Amino acid sequence: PEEAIADLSVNMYNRLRATGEDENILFSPLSIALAMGMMELGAQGSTQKEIRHSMGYDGEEFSFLKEFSNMVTAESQYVMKIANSLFVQNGFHVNEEFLQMMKKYFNAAVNHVDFSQNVAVANYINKWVENNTNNLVKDLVSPRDFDAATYLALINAVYFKGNWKSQFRPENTRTFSFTKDDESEVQIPMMYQQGEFYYGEFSDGGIYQVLEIPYEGDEISMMLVLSRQEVPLATLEPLVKAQLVEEWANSVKKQKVEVYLPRFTVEQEIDLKDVLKALGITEIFIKDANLTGLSDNKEIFLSKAIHKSFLEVNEEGSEAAAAISRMAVLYPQVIVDHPFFFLIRNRRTGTILFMGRVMHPETM
Template sequence: LYFLLLLTITTFNFSSFFSNPTLFHSIHPSFPQLSDNIIFSPLSVAVALGMVELGARGASLEEIRQAVGFSHLLPGVEFSLLQNLTTALTDDDTHYVIRFANSLFLQEGVTFNPEFLHLMKKYFRADVETVDFSESSAVADQINNWVENHTESKIRALLSAEDFSSVTRLTLVNAVYFRGSWKNQFRPENTRTFSFSKDDGSEVQTLMMYQQGDFYYGEFSDGSQEAGGVYQVLEMPYEGEDMSMMIVLPRQEVPLASLEPIIKAPLLEEWANNVKRQKVEVYLPRFKVEQKIDLRNTLQDLGIKNIFTNDADLSAMTDGKDLYIGKAVQKAYLEVTEEGAEGAVGSGMIALTRTLVLYPQVMADHPFFFVIRNRRTGSILFMGRVMTPEVIEPSDHDFDSM
């Protein structure tokens, strides 16, 4: 899993970035196709907004605190909370790998507040580099190389020369990298081709992984027709069990969009607290989700509007009063295979069936939601939806061998 968040701060007009566990509803309308896969990182965007908050004052500061949910805290406490949270996530490197990397690229010749730079290093361990944004091609290459180095080259060519100009003053970059293996890995020899039914009624052929094992499982209903009645929640831990992937699956005849209105942070917590460990038959397609998102409209929907206007106050960054957020880009990458990170495909050894089931069966052969979370802290590292998994064409070698 990889996530990249970019904030470019310029002078003269405005745009920015953010996310939290309730963001799914705000992100979804920004996509023209209801059939699109979605992936984003609530935690990572919260960290990036924290970096902006360090330099904000007045209404700009208050809107960020209100949207992220920090308004009930004493000013400044949130920075320690974000610092402690990211530290806790990166403590265990024996079972999985999570790396947070933050960097500041400053326009050379511009004086920035030393206290702002000090706090960025203290709370976010941010690297600081000076560049000449008027040399836009060179700066784009430099930042893209930084991003590649911190995402094991999974996110490339994020920016272009057109993203910078002579009025760009500061760029904040936040990257998150996660690599984990399933605690109970899928056996590659049990993977076989299977039909995946899309919400538009069409079908595609995909590689369906299978295993029977002990997982956290529950069946839930919101008590109305919004979610189409009962839906399944499966939580599969990665090695170490601190990190897990939660799969939320409606009935096959129910479009995934019917479930979207109820996906909120309190419900995610309710699911996590009520799933029970039991033996489950799991059919999960291999899938890969990669996405680049402009979150300006999303942030505005969440109430962060001031920083997108000429009234923006980022005076804690520099004495100048003409700073504003000029670019907001998020890019995320997720690949799910038999091993959890990358796995090989083998020939099919089992017959998939919906009958004679001895244990609860989660058959993800139609669209579903996923959440990557830390089970100790409850923090959500990634969430999204799979409308179309990895597609195998009949002419593909893998399809023929299966």
């Protein structure tokens, strides 16, 4: 099932590593899976067979895609904000039924603009996004993204901030230096607690740690992957493959671990196209794309695709309660004070919500 969402994230990750040396990396393979759903709803024949293949082959699917945008978005703890939308030029008429489907399954939204007024559309689209991220995701696009061209444009942004299951007490939050992989250090707030998590060490092709902090509700969790003090994260990254991810979750063991987690925020905005292309998604991007599913107009293809994810982490959470020798106990430490790989996952369904890497945890 989401087995597939597994692969998709991993691929997108590896591509972005290659075309992204040394910057922070965040994206919701969930969100992006919905975006492509829309496209698939609009595509037919040659183009549709291409989005079906590159994503999840067997339909089916939307059901699935209806689950996510809802069963992981519609409670008191862990906030998901998703703005999925397609923006199409004024002369082009989107088929009466495509608009029904788009709302029936994805609950997204189609808009009409005049890309020739490239500033006004750019101001309109930033606003719209804010209007659907409770004003948390700003500055998605600029006037130069648009011109009389463009015809239509995919916009896809996500905010997420969850509630820790065992909450860090802010009285243990202290200022730590965070050494970046270029050995420059910035100071951060370092949350800390001793509690029970899923933990575990693994080795390379040296041993790195994997620490899976659950959110309130047990449905979701964030999984960190942190290497040894001298070792650049780029060392471990190549290892990220579907199999290893699922291995980590087959393998980590619940147990009482000392955690040092910085209070931080990660936000990354990619252009959705290179990455899609890299995954074999190319036809929706060319003149003779086949989107006769969304409109009768000859003529229409995809021109802009922008993702932006935003993830916030801090102390907030619930209250939790809490032997080798009976005369002594040994606790592992996880001091997350240098760059890490992490992903956010549905521990039950195994859907990935975010994959990324903190390279510069700074704020301001």
